[model samples]
Target chain A: ADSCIQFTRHASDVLLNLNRLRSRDILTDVVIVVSREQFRAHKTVLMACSGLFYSIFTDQLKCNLSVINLDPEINPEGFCILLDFMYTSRLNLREGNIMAVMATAMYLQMEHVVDTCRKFIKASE
Target chain B: ADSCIQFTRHASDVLLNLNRLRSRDILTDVVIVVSREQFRAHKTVLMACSGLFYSIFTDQLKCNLSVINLDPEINPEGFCILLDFMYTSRLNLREGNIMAVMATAMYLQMEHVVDTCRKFIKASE
Candidate 1:
């Protein structure tokens, strides 16, 4: 007998929970200040996912950080999108902001995001 | 035109980064003490994923804790398996340890793992 199964995969559930954490602002340890806008985040989550964050957080001179001040050129909206990606493991690729996100992803050393950006760009060509 | 498209999903990359975090013991903020063995973990990650832990760490009476002492009945191996599931969103369901893992998953209030355990058990029948 063949029947449809209704169940959430463990992977999907994990991602959903992560998204919830972002929405609720739960257990955030780091504050990112970008262009006068603040984004609360988890240092572990950021370091776990981004090489640049890992290096910045692990370095002795920069280790005991509570806030990260970012340059004005880095779009706050795009950076928020990256933060969403970091927490939820999903990226919104729209023509209006893909290139901006890709650039920020590159600067942050998020190879996976950069790669996906490249693929989407190529596909759109 | 038919073409093969290959690109890693952002979700998969997130899981891979979590796995790498586990392997490197990077940015862990909490310590799980089970049977005199300590497992380094991220509080945000654990709280974001497990309700039991979220409660334990959030309750004022229970909060401000860094070390968690588990009951002897909680199998360290089984707990590690659950922790692995929490970080990587993947579970190992071996015949020798599935039941034990399921038990730990239930105790930890990891509903996703419990669901997977139920499905695996049902599928085996």
Candidate 2:
């Protein structure tokens, strides 16, 4: 049993294809550690940015799963900021908006976006 | 048979409840003309802004449907801006970012957001 966490769908597909090409008879089992809901949401998100990731992953490998939706009450504005970051890895760290966006990015599990936002904010200060 | 397109879920629920209250059986039939895919995406988008609308409508009427994912080639930066608008009806109409955000808001069918952005831009001229 082979277990590894693949962040992007493109990377996962490449690994799967390589697995197949090497030997269909190989004793390698792949387990994608992703929630169905998150997977599905990611697909929807990806659809809106296909050109950025299309060539990397074949459609078949994309999951149709759904992930638990986040609560809006905790911090509606922050969550919205995170959602935007997920769609586009760009953020404007203008005063007052930076912290909220970074917090939301962290809450939404968008590590790359969060890290980038954090770094920018830190640099600004 | 009533033909009307409800813009928001809150509006739809209000109409539905009004129908139920009017003698429990009026000659009004509500036909929610919303695609499943778009509805789902809306719900997901709404979930990121529940408190903003929770007071207006109870959760019962919220539909858990899926929307046709958008093509990624269609201006991702713009789509992200539209998504941000849905979460918060606020935008930064800075000289450089205004056009891109406004364009995305229009493409995503966010009329109010688009109109707001347009109005802001027009005023700046």
Candidate 3:
């Protein structure tokens, strides 16, 4: 008999349930399921995209739009790291600083922040 | 015997690889893997974020900030749909019009375009 590689749905049922919350008009409630293979393939580009996403969104919303102005000196790595998470949804935060930024971003309705943060946590190593 | 929901090791390997790729910084290739659960929880919010992300980036690169401009009429619905996908990375384009938008967006080096388009494809029902 030939050996076969079977794909098992290891993700929990709760994961699928997340899609049900979407409203009609497809305007609300959305889900994204990225594969590990896909993540590995595009990791570098993704980080760059995350970086660009942060720089762009920060310029537009954080500073340009004048909503939340983050002082990088005080936070330095945390700022970029948090921003990175906001874009990539993955982080190497040794001090859990990304979580704090995520909370603030989420409270303020910063979609980029929330989205990136969620990706960071989801992609955590 | 206690029923245990065991976490698989394969995901770990992939997750680990994702972290390593972040070392290089270039705005090129990127990947995002969204879980069904988180997708459900922040669906509406994410969609809005997606919409806003689309509008903002489009305005910044494709339409505003003087770099480029996108026509609102030639493909109005497709335009907005592209913008939505750019942000949410998910879509419900009944006629696959969003796919055309994706091709245009991707060809334009619009990060928001690629992000949202991928989201749309990934989040497809």
Candidate 4:
């Protein structure tokens, strides 16, 4: 009766759909302005995924602020990956960019993302 | 820059929200009839998680039918655990019922659940 199941796979698809919502521009409530680049997302989704974003949306800013200017050091490409992960729950870890994405994930207080990066790094080594 | 991240945590939260959807009966389109018990769920969610469910929903049944009668051998309690895992991506594997759950998960074609059950059983031994 060992009928093992991984429910996380279904969870991944759900997050993937949320990612699709971003691409379709459906119900996206906030804009993440990183350097000269702009990324659209849902406030609840971002807050639910990242402590930093949660703090920004909940504590530092009040009603009506939809656009956020991130730290100058946050690479646009790396931030894009982080933002995508928040929505899609998928991240491509490569030797070239894993460090950068990991750093960005850390600044955002995304412990899970940091942990994944560490696991990937450990496995690669 | 090794700020490792595990995006699957976000994925798990998304699944947990879907689990909440079942509790609230929000957007649940299908009903699973297990013996005398009935569990409401989303068709897409079930199909996305289990291949057997996908086949039943897509190939065997046509549109407009909402109720599905499960296998007679499927334990109501174990099936409930499977259903919850399908939505929440979480399962409690106890020594007493792990074997029953594993068998049910296998019949439902949920490999991850089977794998998890095996891991738990091995660890306990």
Report the C-alpha lDDT of model 1 over A3-106, residue by residue, as the tens digit: 21223355556656766776777666779998899998877667766888988887877768889887778888789878877766657767788898898888
What's the distance in Å from true for residue A75, model 1?
A: 1.6
Candidate 1's displacement at residue A114, Å, is 3.6
Q: Candidate 3 residues A1-125, lDDT tens each? A: 12211113211111122122221222211121122111111122122234432454334243233122333323444444433333333443442566765654543344555565677678876
Task: List DockQ, one per candidate, in order.
Answer: 0.24, 0.01, 0.05, 0.16
Residue-wise lDDT of candidate 4 within B3-106, one digit each (tens)? 34344466777566556556866546778888879988866567667768766755534435788888888888888888877776667666778988998899
Counting only residues 3 or more apart in sequence or on different chains, how many pairs clash (N, Cα, C under 3 Å) in candidate 3?
A: 26
Best by DockQ: 1
lDDT of 4 at B40: 89
- Please give each candidate's TM-score: 0.80, 0.26, 0.27, 0.51
Q: How far off is model 1, as Cα RMSD?
A: 5.9
Q: Cα lDDT of model 4 overall?
A: 0.73
Candidate 4's displacement at residue B19, Å, is: 1.5
Of 3 and 4, the candidate ranking higher by lDDT: 4
Residue A68 miss distance in model 3 (angstroms): 8.4
Q: What is the lDDT of residue A27 in candidate 2?
A: 19
- Runs in model 3 with CA error above 4 Å? A1-75, A95-125, B1-73, B96-125
> Which candidate leads the pack in lDDT?
1
Question: If the candidates were sorted by their lDDT against the true structure, best first, what order would they fall in?
Answer: 1, 4, 2, 3
